[PDB]
Amino acid sequence: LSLTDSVYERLLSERIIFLGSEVNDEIANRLCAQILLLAAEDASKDISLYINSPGGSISAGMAIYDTMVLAPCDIATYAMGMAASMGEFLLAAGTKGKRYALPHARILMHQPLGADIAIQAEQFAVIKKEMFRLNAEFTGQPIERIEADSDRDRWFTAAEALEYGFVDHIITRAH
Amino acid sequence: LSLTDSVYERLLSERIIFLGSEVNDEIANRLCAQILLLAAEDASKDISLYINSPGGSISAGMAIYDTMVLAPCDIATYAMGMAASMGEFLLAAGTKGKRYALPHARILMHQPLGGAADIAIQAEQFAVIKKEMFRLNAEFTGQPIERIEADSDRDRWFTAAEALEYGFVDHIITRA
Amino acid sequence: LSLTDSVYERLLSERIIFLGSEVNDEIANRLCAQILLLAAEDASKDISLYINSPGGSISAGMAIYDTMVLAPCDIATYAMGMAASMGEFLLAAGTKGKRYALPHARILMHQPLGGADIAIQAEQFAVIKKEMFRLNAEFTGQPIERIEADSDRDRWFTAAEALEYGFVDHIITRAHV
Amino acid sequence: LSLTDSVYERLLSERIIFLGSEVNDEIANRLCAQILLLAAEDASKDISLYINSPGGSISAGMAIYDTMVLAPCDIATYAMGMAASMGEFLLAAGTKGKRYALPHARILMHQPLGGGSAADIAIQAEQFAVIKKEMFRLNAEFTGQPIERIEADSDRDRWFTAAEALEYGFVDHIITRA
Amino acid sequence: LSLTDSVYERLLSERIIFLGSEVNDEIANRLCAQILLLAAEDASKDISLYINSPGGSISAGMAIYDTMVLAPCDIATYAMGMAASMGEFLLAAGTKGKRYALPHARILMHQPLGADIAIQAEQFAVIKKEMFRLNAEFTGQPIERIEADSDRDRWFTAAEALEYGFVDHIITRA
Amino acid sequence: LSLTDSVYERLLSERIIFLGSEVNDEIANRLCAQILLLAAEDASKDISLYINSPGGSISAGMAIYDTMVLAPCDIATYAMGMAASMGEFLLAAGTKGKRYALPHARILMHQPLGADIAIQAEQFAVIKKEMFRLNAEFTGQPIERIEADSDRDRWFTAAEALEYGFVDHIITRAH
Amino acid sequence: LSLTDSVYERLLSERIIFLGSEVNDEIANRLCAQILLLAAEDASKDISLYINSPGGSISAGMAIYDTMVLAPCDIATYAMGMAASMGEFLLAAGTKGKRYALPHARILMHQPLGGAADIAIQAEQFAVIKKEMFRLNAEFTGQPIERIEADSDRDRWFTAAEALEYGFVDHIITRA
Amino acid sequence: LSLTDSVYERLLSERIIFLGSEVNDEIANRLCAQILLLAAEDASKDISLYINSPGGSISAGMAIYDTMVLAPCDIATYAMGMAASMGEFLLAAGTKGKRYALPHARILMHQPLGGGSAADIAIQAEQFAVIKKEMFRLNAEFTGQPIERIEADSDRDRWFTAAEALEYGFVDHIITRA
Amino acid sequence: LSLTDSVYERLLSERIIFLGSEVNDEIANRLCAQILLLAAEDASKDISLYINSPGGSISAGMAIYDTMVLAPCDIATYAMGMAASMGEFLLAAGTKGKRYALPHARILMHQPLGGADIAIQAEQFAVIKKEMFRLNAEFTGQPIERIEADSDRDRWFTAAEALEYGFVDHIITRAHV
Amino acid sequence: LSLTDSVYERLLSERIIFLGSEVNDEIANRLCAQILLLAAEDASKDISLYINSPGGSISAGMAIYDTMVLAPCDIATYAMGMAASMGEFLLAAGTKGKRYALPHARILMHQPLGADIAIQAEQFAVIKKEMFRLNAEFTGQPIERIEADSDRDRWFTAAEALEYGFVDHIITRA
Amino acid sequence: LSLTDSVYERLLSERIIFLGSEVNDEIANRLCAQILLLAAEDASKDISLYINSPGGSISAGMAIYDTMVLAPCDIATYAMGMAASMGEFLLAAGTKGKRYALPHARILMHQPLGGVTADIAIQAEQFAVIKKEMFRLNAEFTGQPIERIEADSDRDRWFTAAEALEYGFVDHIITRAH
């Protein structure tokens, strides 16, 4: 094991997980695995997910999301550096009241563009619509607004994000 | 040891196994090994197999399946992200009543194309195991063999709900 | 240590060995090492060898076989996925009564091509080849003529057909606790 | 595990962390991870951050900083070899009174120009402008200098000796002996 | 862990650290880390630094030096094989009375050649001058002589080094 | 220049072109370039296209096809070893009466599966339908039959291909 | 010299140029060089530019465009396979009346995202050239600036016929 | 251009082509290209094909053969070093009366087992079966041997000396001197 | 020979030279070589230098410049895409009256960071830097203070703005036969 | 084209070919190609083969030999540096009276060690025996002596080679 | 051949050679080859050597020089960009009266350290000899005392075009178009 993996492992022991890279099937599987592991170890204690990701595939993020909801314990989400696309989604998907943003974090909305191609298109259409739905639900905004803002790649500061409904807190001082 | 391998091992200690990549001989051997290991450690406790695989070779999947059936303990299967081809097969091959799907999981059917031996022999074997795959798939889902082939042919895919209806899984777990 | 190697080691602790790749000198050395180790640790307890191999070199497989026979403990063999060429040989070489096949396992017979001075190599191959046929016949209880004949035409077997032919003694669907 | 990583881990057990390379997302994530870990292990005990870095991206350094402010415990900063750009920022961002400089340390100011993610150049420019202004503001706050002087000095890449740094307001002490 | 790192770690447990390669930012950080660790573990017990290095960047060696002085415990230095440029500097920077040289060690003096280039030049000039000053302080020689000998890359045997003022002892046996 | 390129160049001088690899944008561009070159050099003399390709992307093959039709001179097509997917299409797209098949050539029909994904799907749908149309036109078979046979990956011998309508001749002897 | 380069050179001798890859500084420089070369060789004879490009950088394309306009001779453009982003721009930038499209060519509109200098400056420049691109695109097609931006925004694409109608090209050449 | 390619090209000018490696699609395409070229240049003059190949895929060799039959000119074949599998086939496929063997050439029969394109194994098996049968047929036609003997000898990898090959019917002459 | 190199050579025959990449010692050597070659071939005929470069090292650009001035023939410069840093310098260094800019060309001013003994390198850079500012001022007809000031803030120009500032003498949309 | 290939081609124009590396299928094909080319160009003019090779596979050398005999023109062989195994064979296989050796050339004899292995063994046995036979024919020595000397890897100087029968002349000057 | 090699070759036809990289055995051999070639082609016509080199090995540069002196024709040297160490040496080694410097050229003196590559003692010996020879010849070229050459070489003294002309490295500063 390397130092980085060691720190992440010791953090895992403290029920702290990181999403600091692009969201894909591999990272998703690992993240899902960690959530399942922590859920198995103790289902009563919260899990803290710190996010600094440019986002990625919808399917991967949705797998992560399902695994999050599957976990009985609360999952606190932290916008650490950047939450874009699915990073933003997973951030907002955090347990209500335990979604935090760091003062200079940046939340980006973005409409991802994503076997038989027709089948892939079908699946993508379905899961995309669902993401917009859930995003609207998380933020409490209209779906029309989610889609509209996603289209024009609207981005938010910590404050703007707090206002919009992505997070519940801004950690300006001594968490 | 890496972080990834460490969590997977710690999960293995919790009798949780993952199929998060394409199915081949290597992954099959590893998966079979894990199943045998857990079966050896404790034959009374369930095994949880989480599936997020695009599928792969029939022979590999069948080896996994045999090892699953071989294990005395029940094997609960979870459609986590995507269960395609053999991912779908292994999902449906789980102990009945303990086959789960997550809300946004996707189940894809597909008839594989297969592909140091004579080509004729390989063709023969593939034909056999393919026919057998369809049979077992029909058995798992409770659908007619004709419908399995028909849907497999046109690469039919299912949502979590549609999959539950078709007979791939027994439950859709929103929360645990 | 890797996840895979960890599982194999943890399995080794359960006296379970794997042959999931082509048979060569390296795999042979490794398998033989494992057999000797388990035999050294405890010579009274069985060893379980699970086979999913396309086969390989005769000399390598024969080395494994010799090491198997050398081991005092019984060696139970399981046709897990595929047992081709030396995979089939090592499968059939298991302790009689403890050779198992899983329902969808496939046993393939095949006459290897083999391949120092070429004349010497040829001599050795002829010898070891003949000996393989002999032992294969002995394992299965078939005539040597039938072994060679079937080997020539790359005859393959299902679990049932293999059980009948004499490669294995059981077809196990499920294991008891 | 390597010797280096072993020393860093054993140091981590002593609540001592290092920033000895250029600041980027990976180093930031790792550093933030370490701070969160130490904060989780014990929120009452100080953390010592030793800095010998040429600096780097603003966003990364700000992420480290945000994580520093997040940590309940005090964070003591040490200018070990060189604190340039964000190295200087994170140095000055240390808990007031526990910001140290080694006798021959060098503090360099510098305005990064940023610049390559999967996004529109206009958006990147906007974000950079905001965080840049925020850096200047906080730097001014840390040093107690006017924002104009921070910008002015950053433009001309002003650098400081340990003494000059102490005077300017980057650090509170110059630790010759311990 | 490898054998080498294992031996070095086991040595670290014995409060023995090595400088057996060129001095750069990486080696500096690692060495400084080790010193801080040992200082943290026990501030009363000495640290033994064995040196066999061709030297390197001044800034790095200075970082090491600052960390050395920062450590409360005494730091004994050993010229094991070769102490050149900053190897010599760190050697002479050892706790007075605890600077040792092995019988066939060789001490080399050398003037290293070393953002905007002007700034880098400024800094280098400063640290260079400071390096000469401290070297003079360590050896007890005039600054003029340090520069003079540094210019012509003067080298010393163990005896010549002992005489010059780099080390305090020549230890044939422990 | 290498020997292979030299032979192909000397063949180009004889107005002979080869398609012996997968059809993609690069190969398409090169092939199109060669057709345009030969068309420029002499618009009255035929061009001979020898095909031994596993096929490839529809868009590429359609570009090749357009460039073929664009060329004023007749383009004779030869099924040399294997004409699959677009190899088959380009074979059948040859000038009527000058489409040849070698005795042991093999013609495979196959339905390819193939920016914003929806857009890609749209484009693919259009060009796919068009391919079926043109294929039906070339072979003189119903579109229903083209689609049906394409679906089940029907393959043809030289004789079966001659019967089906892919080619006009089988070169059994001394062309 | 390779076969590919040889045919392209022999084509160059026939005053035929290709844009068959993504547009960047390198390809731009090469293309500009070829245009200047042909213009130098003969300023009275047309140049034929065949386009099969997914597009690319605006700056690169604009450099090509300036070099096109700089050339005294007419430049006929052919949409061979695909003209996206700057491919579409350069297609429409051809001499009016000599802009051709092949029957199954596809024209895609798209507003690029752009991306050793200050980011603010790069943003400024990009804004300028982008606005200019839209202007010239409107000029080429004869469409309103608003419609160009609007369609560019939603990644509108055209068939050969639709492209002819919109104003990208003047003819659809089935046969020559 | 390399020396080797230069010699091969200068040889091509003399209507002499080589098959000195295993037979695959690339070598086949290249060889077919050469035959078509020589046929285009002059359809009245013979082509000399010198063979020293271990053989290879049936489809490739058959493609070469089809291209040979397509060529109007006679194709003289020379067993230079070794003609195995399809090397033997292409050797025997030469124009009758102009099939030569060098004194120490070796002709090996062998039934390839084929086997990895983007297609279904069943289809590949079908195609292979057909072309295999076709090979045996044509081989029998070339040598004037019964199909059963061709299959029988192929099974047991029968090999021939120059004399034995001449007798069997692979070649028409053994060229000691020229 | 490649297609690209062939076109550049064929262009070289037309006395047309390209600067389409960053300015460094290699590109400098190559450009200087080309200039000397064309000057050697014919010293009476103009040389046309087309520029699309992000700039680079001062010393390299100065070497090119010296070689330009060395050439007896006039050197016509064209801002084709971008002329930044030394690209701008070499653009403005063209023969007066023969410095052209294409309509959408962009000229960027920029003060390089430069980067043997460091003190010596610093000295040399200071000298050559000052000299660059001087020559840039001379080319454009602007005050040195204005050049330094604008260089500091990375001022950039459109074709029109550049024509006004004094970098070029013409804005050419189209060329006559 | 490179300088080396250019010189070899220009030599080819002078009907001079080289064997300066180990003998294998590739070198064999190339050499055979060159011989056929020269034979095609002019069947009346000699071909000069200069040999400096450590030898190699028998089958390859035999292919070369067959092609040599096939060529109607005489083939003069030159032992330039070293003729070992099949280098020696091809040397001795030269046209009688036109087999030359340079004063410090060395001729080495050697028994090479060389689908189904049995078949390969059969073929090797055949070609090996044939190689000994032809070698005996070339040198005019008994087959028993060829095998005997081949077994113990006997080597010859230019003189010893001339005496043994490998070459017909030792050319100090042309 | 590439464009760069083509222009250099075309330049070679104009009797113009380049030294635009560090001096080593390979570059030395190539330059020596070029000089010998030009000398062979025409021994009456001058050769123009343009220098933009950071210098390098003494032995290599000395080989170039020996080859320069060997050439009957005059060799004009041009300090194009940088003439350091042996670049400076070869520059000053040009034919007297035909040594030119470009207006912004820079000539750097430097005492090489040589170093290891047989017995170290021999290598040291050889280096000592040739080093002394360099200083001697440099003094001869510039017309300066050897003591001053060594003294200035020691402290890495550098010159502008004017300073170089004054010192004696070159005979002219070519601003205009000769």
Swiss-Prot record, chains C, I:
Q: Which reaction does it catalyse?
A: Hydrolysis of proteins to small peptides in the presence of ATP and magnesium. alpha-casein is the usual test substrate. In the absence of ATP, only oligopeptides shorter than five residues are hydrolyzed (such as succinyl-Leu-Tyr-|-NHMec, and Leu-Tyr-Leu-|-Tyr-Trp, in which cleavage of the -Tyr-|-Leu- and -Tyr-|-Trp bonds also occurs)
Is the Hydrolase keyword given for this protein? yes
This protein's GO cellular component annotations are: cytosol; endopeptidase Clp complex; plasma membrane
Alphabetical keyword list: Cytoplasm, Hydrolase, Protease, Serine protease
Entry's Gene Ontology molecular function annotations? ATP-dependent peptidase activity; ATPase binding; serine-type endopeptidase activity
Record's Gene3D superfamilies? 2-enoyl-CoA Hydratase, Chain A, domain 1 (3.90.226.10)
* Active-site feature positions: 85, 110
SUPFAM superfamilies recorded for this chain?
Answer: ClpP/crotonase
- Give a Pfam family name: CLP_protease
Q: What is its main location?
A: cytoplasm
The similarity comment for this entry is:
Belongs to the peptidase S14 family.
**What does the subunit section of this Swiss-Prot or TrEMBL entry state?**
Fourteen ClpP subunits assemble into 2 heptameric rings which stack back to back to give a disk-like structure with a central cavity, resembling the structure of eukaryotic proteasomes. Forms a complex with ClpP2 and ClpX.
What protein name is recorded for this chain?
A: ATP-dependent Clp protease proteolytic subunit 1
**What species is this protein from?**
Mycobacterium tuberculosis (strain ATCC 25618 / H37Rv)
